[PDB]
Design an enzyme around this catalytic site. Structure first.
Site, short mmCIF file in Angstrom:
data_model
loop_
_atom_site.label_atom_id
_atom_site.label_comp_id
_atom_site.label_asym_id
_atom_site.label_seq_id
_atom_site.Cartn_x
_atom_site.Cartn_y
_atom_site.Cartn_z
N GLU A 1 39.83 46.59 43.18
CA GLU A 1 38.63 47.45 43.60
C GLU A 1 38.51 47.41 45.05
O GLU A 1 38.40 48.29 45.64
CB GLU A 1 37.42 46.66 42.89
CG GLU A 1 37.22 47.05 41.52
CD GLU A 1 36.58 45.98 40.64
OE1 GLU A 1 35.95 44.95 41.05
OE2 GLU A 1 36.84 46.24 39.34
N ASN B 1 35.60 36.52 37.29
CA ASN B 1 35.28 37.35 38.20
C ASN B 1 33.96 37.97 38.07
O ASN B 1 33.95 38.99 37.50
CB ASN B 1 36.44 38.24 38.58
CG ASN B 1 36.25 39.09 39.80
OD1 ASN B 1 35.32 39.07 40.38
ND2 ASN B 1 37.02 40.16 39.84
N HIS C 1 42.17 42.24 45.02
CA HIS C 1 41.20 42.80 43.84
C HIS C 1 41.89 44.21 43.81
O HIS C 1 41.58 44.91 44.89
CB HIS C 1 40.10 42.29 43.47
CG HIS C 1 39.77 42.72 42.04
ND1 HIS C 1 39.43 43.82 41.65
CD2 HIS C 1 39.98 42.06 41.03
CE1 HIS C 1 39.06 43.98 40.37
NE2 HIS C 1 39.45 42.69 39.95
N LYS D 1 32.49 39.81 40.03
CA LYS D 1 32.20 41.07 40.83
C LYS D 1 30.88 40.94 41.47
O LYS D 1 30.40 40.00 41.90
CB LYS D 1 32.65 42.14 39.93
CG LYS D 1 34.09 41.92 39.29
CD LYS D 1 34.55 43.30 38.75
CE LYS D 1 36.03 43.03 38.01
NZ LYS D 1 36.55 44.27 37.25
N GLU E 1 46.84 42.47 36.96
CA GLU E 1 45.82 43.17 36.37
C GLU E 1 46.13 44.56 36.47
O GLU E 1 46.01 45.38 37.11
CB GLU E 1 44.61 42.90 36.98
CG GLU E 1 44.12 41.52 37.19
CD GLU E 1 42.40 41.42 37.62
OE1 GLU E 1 42.26 41.80 38.61
OE2 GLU E 1 41.70 40.44 36.66
N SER F 1 40.20 43.43 30.78
CA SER F 1 39.52 43.49 29.57
C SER F 1 39.85 42.25 28.46
O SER F 1 40.03 42.45 27.37
CB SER F 1 39.70 44.77 28.78
OG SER F 1 39.32 45.96 29.70
N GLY G 1 38.13 46.89 33.13
CA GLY G 1 36.71 47.29 32.64
C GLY G 1 36.66 48.56 31.74
O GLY G 1 35.59 48.85 31.73
#
Ligand code: NA
Ligand code: NA
Lengths: 242, 242
Positions: free
Chosen positions: A98, A9, A96, A11, A165, A204, A171
Protein backbone atom coordinates in the site's frame (compact mmCIF):
# COMPACT_ATOMS: atom_id res chain seq x y z
CA UNK A 1 14.07 -24.49 13.54
CA UNK A 2 13.03 -21.17 12.03
CA UNK A 3 11.08 -18.71 14.17
CA UNK A 4 7.29 -18.81 13.77
CA UNK A 5 5.87 -15.28 13.63
CA UNK A 6 2.17 -14.48 13.44
CA UNK A 7 1.80 -10.76 12.82
CA UNK A 8 -1.35 -8.66 12.58
CA UNK A 9 -1.26 -5.65 10.31
CA UNK A 10 -4.12 -3.45 11.54
CA UNK A 11 -3.38 -0.94 8.74
CA UNK A 12 -5.27 2.33 9.35
CA UNK A 13 -7.61 0.96 12.00
CA UNK A 14 -8.17 1.46 15.74
CA UNK A 15 -8.06 4.48 17.97
CA UNK A 16 -6.30 4.04 21.29
CA UNK A 17 -9.65 3.26 22.93
CA UNK A 18 -10.38 0.65 20.24
CA UNK A 19 -6.89 -0.80 20.59
CA UNK A 20 -7.41 -1.15 24.32
CA UNK A 21 -10.73 -2.97 23.80
CA UNK A 22 -9.03 -5.32 21.32
CA UNK A 23 -6.36 -6.17 23.87
CA UNK A 24 -8.98 -6.75 26.60
CA UNK A 25 -10.50 -9.46 24.38
CA UNK A 26 -7.30 -10.81 22.83
CA UNK A 27 -4.90 -11.35 25.76
CA UNK A 28 -6.84 -14.21 27.43
CA UNK A 29 -7.28 -16.06 24.14
CA UNK A 30 -3.58 -16.57 23.38
CA UNK A 31 -2.34 -17.25 26.92
CA UNK A 32 -1.77 -20.91 26.05
CA UNK A 33 -0.40 -20.52 22.53
CA UNK A 34 2.92 -22.34 22.17
CA UNK A 35 5.49 -20.08 23.85
CA UNK A 36 7.83 -20.38 20.87
CA UNK A 37 5.36 -18.55 18.60
CA UNK A 38 6.04 -14.85 18.20
CA UNK A 39 2.83 -12.80 18.23
CA UNK A 40 3.07 -9.28 16.81
CA UNK A 41 0.51 -6.48 16.50
CA UNK A 42 1.54 -3.88 13.90
CA UNK A 43 -0.48 -0.82 14.80
CA UNK A 44 -0.87 2.87 13.92
CA UNK A 45 1.82 5.23 15.25
CA UNK A 46 -0.68 6.84 17.62
CA UNK A 47 -1.45 3.47 19.30
CA UNK A 48 2.16 2.43 20.00
CA UNK A 49 2.83 4.11 23.36
CA UNK A 50 -0.50 3.24 24.96
CA UNK A 51 -0.38 -0.37 23.81
CA UNK A 52 3.27 -0.58 24.93
CA UNK A 53 2.11 0.18 28.49
CA UNK A 54 -0.70 -2.40 28.36
CA UNK A 55 1.56 -5.13 26.97
CA UNK A 56 4.74 -4.58 29.01
CA UNK A 57 6.02 -7.85 30.47
CA UNK A 58 3.67 -9.94 28.30
CA UNK A 59 4.37 -12.08 25.24
CA UNK A 60 2.80 -9.84 22.59
CA UNK A 61 5.25 -7.67 20.62
CA UNK A 62 4.40 -4.39 18.91
CA UNK A 63 5.25 -3.35 15.38
CA UNK A 64 5.05 0.00 13.65
CA UNK A 65 3.69 0.13 10.11
CA UNK A 66 6.52 2.30 8.71
CA UNK A 67 9.79 3.98 9.63
CA UNK A 68 11.85 6.51 7.69
CA UNK A 69 15.40 5.86 6.49
CA UNK A 70 17.09 8.94 8.03
CA UNK A 71 17.70 9.51 11.73
CA UNK A 72 16.03 12.96 11.57
CA UNK A 73 15.42 15.62 8.99
CA UNK A 74 13.12 17.43 6.60
CA UNK A 75 10.57 14.66 6.03
CA UNK A 76 7.28 16.14 7.21
CA UNK A 77 4.94 13.42 8.41
CA UNK A 78 7.59 10.69 8.78
CA UNK A 79 8.60 8.82 11.95
CA UNK A 80 12.23 8.00 12.75
CA UNK A 81 13.75 4.85 14.22
CA UNK A 82 14.69 6.78 17.39
CA UNK A 83 11.04 7.71 17.89
CA UNK A 84 10.14 4.03 17.71
CA UNK A 85 12.89 2.61 19.91
CA UNK A 86 12.08 5.19 22.59
CA UNK A 87 8.70 3.43 22.93
CA UNK A 88 10.41 0.05 23.10
CA UNK A 89 8.63 -1.65 20.22
CA UNK A 90 10.18 -4.61 18.43
CA UNK A 91 9.05 -4.77 14.78
CA UNK A 92 8.36 -2.51 11.82
CA UNK A 93 6.54 -3.33 8.58
CA UNK A 94 8.49 -1.93 5.65
CA UNK A 95 7.68 -1.70 1.97
CA UNK A 96 4.05 -2.74 2.32
CA UNK A 97 2.33 -2.82 -1.07
CA UNK A 98 0.00 0.00 0.00
CA UNK A 99 2.92 2.34 0.52
CA UNK A 100 4.35 1.33 -2.88
CA UNK A 101 0.97 1.78 -4.56
CA UNK A 102 -0.04 5.10 -3.01
CA UNK A 103 2.82 6.72 -1.19
CA UNK A 104 5.88 6.60 -3.42
CA UNK A 105 7.77 3.68 -1.83
CA UNK A 106 10.40 2.19 -4.14
CA UNK A 107 12.56 -0.89 -3.73
CA UNK A 108 15.39 1.54 -3.00
CA UNK A 109 13.60 3.44 -0.25
CA UNK A 110 12.29 0.18 1.22
CA UNK A 111 15.90 -1.02 1.46
CA UNK A 112 16.99 2.21 3.15
CA UNK A 113 14.16 1.94 5.72
CA UNK A 114 15.16 -1.66 6.48
CA UNK A 115 18.73 -0.50 7.11
CA UNK A 116 17.56 2.28 9.42
CA UNK A 117 15.35 -0.14 11.37
CA UNK A 118 18.14 -2.70 11.77
CA UNK A 119 20.71 -0.20 13.01
CA UNK A 120 18.22 0.83 15.71
CA UNK A 121 17.65 -2.76 16.80
CA UNK A 122 14.18 -3.04 15.33
CA UNK A 123 13.19 -6.20 13.45
CA UNK A 124 12.15 -5.25 9.89
CA UNK A 125 9.38 -7.09 8.08
CA UNK A 126 10.16 -6.43 4.42
CA UNK A 127 7.12 -6.90 2.16
CA UNK A 128 7.47 -8.11 -1.43
CA UNK A 129 4.88 -9.14 -3.95
CA UNK A 130 3.88 -9.16 -7.62
CA UNK A 131 0.86 -7.51 -9.22
CA UNK A 132 -1.96 -9.32 -11.01
CA UNK A 133 -0.59 -8.05 -14.34
CA UNK A 134 2.93 -9.22 -13.43
CA UNK A 135 1.61 -12.64 -12.40
CA UNK A 136 -0.52 -12.88 -15.56
CA UNK A 137 2.43 -11.86 -17.73
CA UNK A 138 4.43 -14.73 -16.20
CA UNK A 139 6.77 -12.33 -14.39
CA UNK A 140 6.37 -13.37 -10.72
CA UNK A 141 9.82 -14.97 -10.37
CA UNK A 142 11.71 -12.04 -11.94
CA UNK A 143 9.74 -9.41 -10.00
CA UNK A 144 10.20 -11.17 -6.65
CA UNK A 145 13.90 -11.85 -7.18
CA UNK A 146 14.46 -8.19 -8.07
CA UNK A 147 12.51 -6.88 -5.06
CA UNK A 148 14.49 -9.16 -2.75
CA UNK A 149 17.85 -8.25 -4.28
CA UNK A 150 17.15 -4.51 -4.18
CA UNK A 151 15.45 -4.71 -0.80
CA UNK A 152 18.33 -6.51 0.91
CA UNK A 153 21.42 -4.55 -0.21
CA UNK A 154 23.65 -4.28 2.91
CA UNK A 155 20.87 -5.81 5.05
CA UNK A 156 21.74 -8.04 8.04
CA UNK A 157 19.98 -11.31 7.26
CA UNK A 158 20.23 -12.38 10.90
CA UNK A 159 17.69 -9.64 11.81
CA UNK A 160 15.17 -9.89 9.00
CA UNK A 161 11.62 -11.06 8.34
CA UNK A 162 10.25 -11.22 4.80
CA UNK A 163 6.54 -11.25 3.98
CA UNK A 164 5.49 -12.46 0.53
CA UNK A 165 2.16 -10.74 -0.15
CA UNK A 166 0.96 -11.24 -3.75
CA UNK A 167 -0.75 -7.91 -4.32
CA UNK A 168 -3.84 -9.47 -5.87
CA UNK A 169 -4.43 -11.44 -2.64
CA UNK A 170 -4.36 -8.38 -0.35
CA UNK A 171 -7.80 -7.50 0.97
CA UNK A 172 -9.55 -9.30 -1.90
CA UNK A 173 -10.37 -12.65 -0.31
CA UNK A 174 -8.40 -14.23 -3.19
CA UNK A 175 -5.92 -16.14 -1.05
CA UNK A 176 -2.90 -17.50 -2.90
CA UNK A 177 -2.89 -21.28 -3.15
CA UNK A 178 -0.81 -22.54 -0.24
CA UNK A 179 1.42 -24.65 -2.49
CA UNK A 180 2.04 -21.67 -4.75
CA UNK A 181 2.92 -19.42 -1.81
CA UNK A 182 5.29 -22.18 -0.71
CA UNK A 183 6.82 -22.20 -4.20
CA UNK A 184 7.46 -18.46 -4.34
CA UNK A 185 8.64 -18.31 -0.73
CA UNK A 186 11.04 -21.15 -1.53
CA UNK A 187 12.33 -19.02 -4.40
CA UNK A 188 12.84 -16.11 -2.00
CA UNK A 189 14.71 -18.35 0.45
CA UNK A 190 17.00 -19.39 -2.41
CA UNK A 191 18.16 -15.78 -2.84
CA UNK A 192 19.13 -15.47 0.81
CA UNK A 193 22.50 -15.99 2.43
CA UNK A 194 20.80 -16.92 5.73
CA UNK A 195 18.30 -19.68 4.94
CA UNK A 196 16.96 -19.46 8.53
CA UNK A 197 15.15 -16.16 7.84
CA UNK A 198 11.48 -16.27 8.85
CA UNK A 199 9.44 -15.84 5.65
CA UNK A 200 5.71 -15.11 6.05
CA UNK A 201 2.80 -15.33 3.68
CA UNK A 202 0.34 -12.45 3.58
CA UNK A 203 -2.82 -11.91 1.60
CA UNK A 204 -6.29 -12.83 2.86
CA UNK A 205 -5.05 -15.13 5.62
CA UNK A 206 -7.99 -15.99 7.85
CA UNK A 207 -8.81 -18.43 10.62
CA UNK A 208 -9.94 -21.02 8.05
CA UNK A 209 -6.77 -21.17 5.89
CA UNK A 210 -4.04 -20.45 8.46
CA UNK A 211 -3.50 -24.16 9.27
CA UNK A 212 -3.09 -25.05 5.60
CA UNK A 213 -0.72 -22.12 4.96
CA UNK A 214 1.49 -22.86 7.99
CA UNK A 215 1.58 -26.52 6.94
CA UNK A 216 3.75 -25.54 3.94
CA UNK A 217 7.41 -26.34 4.69
CA UNK A 218 8.85 -23.01 3.47
CA UNK A 219 6.29 -20.84 5.27
CA UNK A 220 7.15 -19.68 8.78
CA UNK A 221 4.38 -17.24 9.59
CA UNK A 222 1.64 -14.92 8.41
CA UNK A 223 1.12 -11.16 8.02
CA UNK A 224 -2.61 -10.83 8.59
CA UNK A 225 -4.66 -7.80 7.57
CA UNK A 226 -8.43 -7.84 7.85
CA UNK A 227 -8.54 -11.02 9.93
CA UNK A 228 -6.29 -9.42 12.56
CA UNK A 229 -8.79 -6.65 13.42
CA UNK A 230 -10.89 -8.57 15.93
CA UNK A 231 -9.63 -10.66 18.85
CA UNK A 232 -11.30 -14.05 18.31
CA UNK A 233 -10.29 -14.14 14.64
CA UNK A 234 -6.69 -13.14 15.28
CA UNK A 235 -6.43 -15.49 18.27
CA UNK A 236 -7.48 -18.49 16.14
CA UNK A 237 -4.75 -17.54 13.68
CA UNK A 238 -2.19 -17.27 16.49
CA UNK A 239 -3.51 -20.62 17.78
CA UNK A 240 -3.10 -22.36 14.42
CA UNK A 241 -2.97 -26.16 14.45
CA UNK A 242 -1.04 -28.17 15.27
CA UNK B 1 -8.91 41.23 11.66
CA UNK B 2 -7.62 37.91 10.31
CA UNK B 3 -6.20 35.44 12.81
CA UNK B 4 -2.42 35.53 13.30
CA UNK B 5 -1.00 31.99 13.44
CA UNK B 6 2.66 31.19 14.10
CA UNK B 7 3.20 27.48 13.52
CA UNK B 8 6.32 25.39 13.96
CA UNK B 9 6.75 22.40 11.69
CA UNK B 10 9.28 20.18 13.49
CA UNK B 11 9.18 17.75 10.56
CA UNK B 12 10.93 14.49 11.49
CA UNK B 13 12.55 15.80 14.67
CA UNK B 14 12.24 15.15 18.42
CA UNK B 15 11.60 12.03 20.46
CA UNK B 16 9.14 12.40 23.33
CA UNK B 17 12.08 13.22 25.63
CA UNK B 18 13.34 15.91 23.25
CA UNK B 19 9.83 17.30 22.82
CA UNK B 20 9.43 17.52 26.60
CA UNK B 21 12.74 19.37 26.94
CA UNK B 22 11.68 21.81 24.22
CA UNK B 23 8.45 22.62 26.05
CA UNK B 24 10.38 23.26 29.28
CA UNK B 25 12.44 25.94 27.59
CA UNK B 26 9.62 27.26 25.40
CA UNK B 27 6.69 27.71 27.80
CA UNK B 28 8.43 30.42 29.91
CA UNK B 29 9.29 32.41 26.76
CA UNK B 30 5.76 32.78 25.35
CA UNK B 31 3.92 33.07 28.67
CA UNK B 32 3.36 36.79 28.04
CA UNK B 33 2.99 36.64 24.24
CA UNK B 34 0.15 38.68 22.75
CA UNK B 35 -2.97 36.63 23.39
CA UNK B 36 -4.24 37.29 19.86
CA UNK B 37 -1.37 35.25 18.35
CA UNK B 38 -2.10 31.56 17.87
CA UNK B 39 0.98 29.44 18.64
CA UNK B 40 1.08 25.98 17.07
CA UNK B 41 3.59 23.14 17.25
CA UNK B 42 3.19 20.58 14.42
CA UNK B 43 4.97 17.53 15.78
CA UNK B 44 5.56 13.86 14.92
CA UNK B 45 2.65 11.49 15.52
CA UNK B 46 4.51 9.79 18.38
CA UNK B 47 4.87 13.09 20.29
CA UNK B 48 1.24 14.23 20.12
CA UNK B 49 -0.25 12.42 23.12
CA UNK B 50 2.66 13.14 25.47
CA UNK B 51 2.84 16.81 24.56
CA UNK B 52 -0.94 17.15 24.84
CA UNK B 53 -0.74 16.13 28.50
CA UNK B 54 1.94 18.79 29.11
CA UNK B 55 -0.10 21.54 27.42
CA UNK B 56 -3.53 21.41 29.09
CA UNK B 57 -4.70 24.88 30.04
CA UNK B 58 -1.88 26.58 28.13
CA UNK B 59 -2.01 28.60 24.97
CA UNK B 60 0.13 26.34 22.76
CA UNK B 61 -1.86 24.28 20.31
CA UNK B 62 -0.75 21.04 18.65
CA UNK B 63 -0.83 19.96 15.06
CA UNK B 64 -0.07 16.72 13.32
CA UNK B 65 2.02 16.71 10.13
CA UNK B 66 -0.36 14.59 8.04
CA UNK B 67 -3.74 12.85 8.13
CA UNK B 68 -5.27 10.41 5.66
CA UNK B 69 -8.42 11.09 3.65
CA UNK B 70 -10.41 7.98 4.68
CA UNK B 71 -11.90 7.30 8.10
CA UNK B 72 -10.22 3.85 8.26
CA UNK B 73 -9.01 1.23 5.83
CA UNK B 74 -6.21 -0.49 3.95
CA UNK B 75 -3.61 2.27 4.13
CA UNK B 76 -0.68 0.76 6.00
CA UNK B 77 1.32 3.48 7.80
CA UNK B 78 -1.39 6.20 7.61
CA UNK B 79 -3.14 7.96 10.49
CA UNK B 80 -6.84 8.78 10.41
CA UNK B 81 -8.66 11.87 11.59
CA UNK B 82 -10.32 9.89 14.40
CA UNK B 83 -6.89 8.90 15.68
CA UNK B 84 -5.96 12.59 15.88
CA UNK B 85 -9.18 13.95 17.36
CA UNK B 86 -8.99 11.29 20.06
CA UNK B 87 -5.86 13.06 21.27
CA UNK B 88 -7.64 16.42 21.04
CA UNK B 89 -5.18 18.24 18.81
CA UNK B 90 -6.23 21.28 16.83
CA UNK B 91 -4.26 21.48 13.55
CA UNK B 92 -2.91 19.29 10.78
CA UNK B 93 -0.36 20.17 8.09
CA UNK B 94 -1.62 18.86 4.75
CA UNK B 95 0.07 18.72 1.38
CA UNK B 96 3.53 19.71 2.60
CA UNK B 97 5.99 19.81 -0.29
CA UNK B 98 8.01 17.00 1.27
CA UNK B 99 4.96 14.69 0.99
CA UNK B 100 4.48 15.78 -2.64
CA UNK B 101 8.17 15.35 -3.45
CA UNK B 102 8.82 11.98 -1.79
CA UNK B 103 5.59 10.30 -0.75
CA UNK B 104 3.16 10.51 -3.65
CA UNK B 105 0.98 13.41 -2.49
CA UNK B 106 -1.02 14.99 -5.32
CA UNK B 107 -3.25 18.04 -5.40
CA UNK B 108 -6.16 15.60 -5.43
CA UNK B 109 -5.06 13.65 -2.36
CA UNK B 110 -4.17 16.86 -0.51
CA UNK B 111 -7.73 18.07 -1.16
CA UNK B 112 -9.20 14.82 0.11
CA UNK B 113 -7.08 14.98 3.29
CA UNK B 114 -8.23 18.57 3.89
CA UNK B 115 -11.87 17.45 3.63
CA UNK B 116 -11.25 14.62 6.10
CA UNK B 117 -9.59 16.96 8.61
CA UNK B 118 -12.45 19.47 8.35
CA UNK B 119 -15.18 16.87 8.81
CA UNK B 120 -13.44 15.81 12.05
CA UNK B 121 -13.11 19.38 13.33
CA UNK B 122 -9.37 19.70 12.75
CA UNK B 123 -8.00 22.94 11.33
CA UNK B 124 -6.16 22.09 8.08
CA UNK B 125 -3.05 23.96 7.03
CA UNK B 126 -2.93 23.37 3.28
CA UNK B 127 0.57 23.88 1.84
CA UNK B 128 1.05 25.17 -1.71
CA UNK B 129 4.18 26.25 -3.52
CA UNK B 130 6.03 26.25 -6.84
CA UNK B 131 9.31 24.52 -7.68
CA UNK B 132 12.50 26.33 -8.64
CA UNK B 133 11.90 25.17 -12.21
CA UNK B 134 8.38 26.60 -12.22
CA UNK B 135 9.61 29.83 -10.59
CA UNK B 136 12.39 30.29 -13.16
CA UNK B 137 9.95 29.53 -16.00
CA UNK B 138 7.64 32.36 -14.88
CA UNK B 139 4.89 29.87 -13.99
CA UNK B 140 4.45 30.66 -10.27
CA UNK B 141 1.06 32.32 -10.63
CA UNK B 142 -0.54 29.66 -12.84
CA UNK B 143 0.92 26.86 -10.69
CA UNK B 144 -0.36 28.39 -7.45
CA UNK B 145 -3.81 29.08 -8.92
CA UNK B 146 -4.00 25.42 -9.92
CA UNK B 147 -2.87 24.07 -6.55
CA UNK B 148 -5.33 26.31 -4.71
CA UNK B 149 -8.22 25.40 -7.03
CA UNK B 150 -7.58 21.67 -6.86
CA UNK B 151 -6.75 21.74 -3.14
CA UNK B 152 -9.97 23.53 -2.15
CA UNK B 153 -12.68 21.61 -4.03
CA UNK B 154 -15.61 21.29 -1.57
CA UNK B 155 -13.45 22.82 1.20
CA UNK B 156 -15.01 24.93 3.97
CA UNK B 157 -13.11 28.20 3.69
CA UNK B 158 -14.23 29.24 7.18
CA UNK B 159 -12.02 26.48 8.68
CA UNK B 160 -8.87 26.73 6.60
CA UNK B 161 -5.27 27.92 6.80
CA UNK B 162 -3.08 28.15 3.70
CA UNK B 163 0.73 28.15 3.85
CA UNK B 164 2.51 29.47 0.78
CA UNK B 165 5.91 27.72 0.86
CA UNK B 166 7.90 28.24 -2.35
CA UNK B 167 9.79 24.98 -2.54
CA UNK B 168 13.18 26.54 -3.30
CA UNK B 169 12.90 28.46 -0.01
CA UNK B 170 12.30 25.40 2.19
CA UNK B 171 15.31 24.41 4.29
CA UNK B 172 17.72 26.28 1.99
CA UNK B 173 18.10 29.63 3.72
CA UNK B 174 16.92 31.22 0.43
CA UNK B 175 14.01 33.06 2.02
CA UNK B 176 11.52 34.50 -0.45
CA UNK B 177 11.56 38.31 -0.50
CA UNK B 178 8.85 39.55 1.85
CA UNK B 179 7.13 41.67 -0.79
CA UNK B 180 7.20 38.68 -3.19
CA UNK B 181 5.59 36.41 -0.61
CA UNK B 182 3.09 39.21 -0.07
CA UNK B 183 2.40 39.42 -3.83
CA UNK B 184 1.79 35.69 -4.27
CA UNK B 185 -0.22 35.46 -1.07
CA UNK B 186 -2.35 38.33 -2.33
CA UNK B 187 -3.03 36.30 -5.47
CA UNK B 188 -4.03 33.31 -3.33
CA UNK B 189 -6.40 35.52 -1.34
CA UNK B 190 -8.00 36.72 -4.61
CA UNK B 191 -8.84 33.11 -5.48
CA UNK B 192 -10.68 32.47 -2.20
CA UNK B 193 -14.36 33.02 -1.52
CA UNK B 194 -13.55 33.87 2.12
CA UNK B 195 -11.04 36.71 2.11
CA UNK B 196 -10.54 36.36 5.90
CA UNK B 197 -8.58 33.08 5.63
CA UNK B 198 -5.24 33.12 7.47
CA UNK B 199 -2.50 32.73 4.85
CA UNK B 200 0.99 31.96 6.15
CA UNK B 201 4.39 32.24 4.56
CA UNK B 202 6.81 29.36 4.95
CA UNK B 203 10.35 28.79 3.76
CA UNK B 204 13.38 29.74 5.85
CA UNK B 205 11.53 32.01 8.25
CA UNK B 206 13.83 32.87 11.14
CA UNK B 207 13.96 35.29 14.05
CA UNK B 208 15.68 37.87 11.81
CA UNK B 209 13.18 37.99 8.94
CA UNK B 210 9.92 37.29 10.79
CA UNK B 211 9.33 40.98 11.55
CA UNK B 212 9.61 42.00 7.89
CA UNK B 213 7.48 39.06 6.72
CA UNK B 214 4.69 39.63 9.23
CA UNK B 215 4.60 43.34 8.44
CA UNK B 216 3.39 42.57 4.90
CA UNK B 217 -0.33 43.38 4.62
CA UNK B 218 -1.38 40.04 3.09
CA UNK B 219 0.67 37.77 5.38
CA UNK B 220 -1.08 36.46 8.50
CA UNK B 221 1.49 34.07 9.91
CA UNK B 222 4.35 31.73 9.33
CA UNK B 223 4.95 27.99 9.00
CA UNK B 224 8.45 27.64 10.44
CA UNK B 225 10.72 24.66 9.88
CA UNK B 226 14.32 24.65 11.07
CA UNK B 227 13.92 27.78 13.20
CA UNK B 228 11.08 26.17 15.19
CA UNK B 229 13.35 23.40 16.52
CA UNK B 230 14.71 25.29 19.51
CA UNK B 231 12.78 27.39 22.00
CA UNK B 232 14.56 30.74 21.96
CA UNK B 233 14.41 30.97 18.16
CA UNK B 234 10.76 29.94 17.90
CA UNK B 235 9.71 32.18 20.81
CA UNK B 236 11.24 35.22 19.11
CA UNK B 237 9.27 34.32 15.99
CA UNK B 238 6.08 34.04 18.06
CA UNK B 239 7.06 37.35 19.67
CA UNK B 240 7.57 39.11 16.35
CA UNK B 241 7.68 42.89 16.55
CA UNK B 242 6.43 45.72 14.30
NA1 NA C 1 5.48 -24.13 7.75
NA1 NA D 1 0.83 40.99 8.07
Amino acid sequence: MRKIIIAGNWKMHKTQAEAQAFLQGFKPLIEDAAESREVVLCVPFTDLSGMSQQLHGGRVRLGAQNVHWEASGAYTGEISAAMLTEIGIHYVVIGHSERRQYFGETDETANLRVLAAQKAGLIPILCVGESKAQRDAGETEQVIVDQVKKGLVNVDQSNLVIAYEPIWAIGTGDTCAATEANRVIGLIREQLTNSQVTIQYGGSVNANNVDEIMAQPEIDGALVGGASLEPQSFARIVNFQP
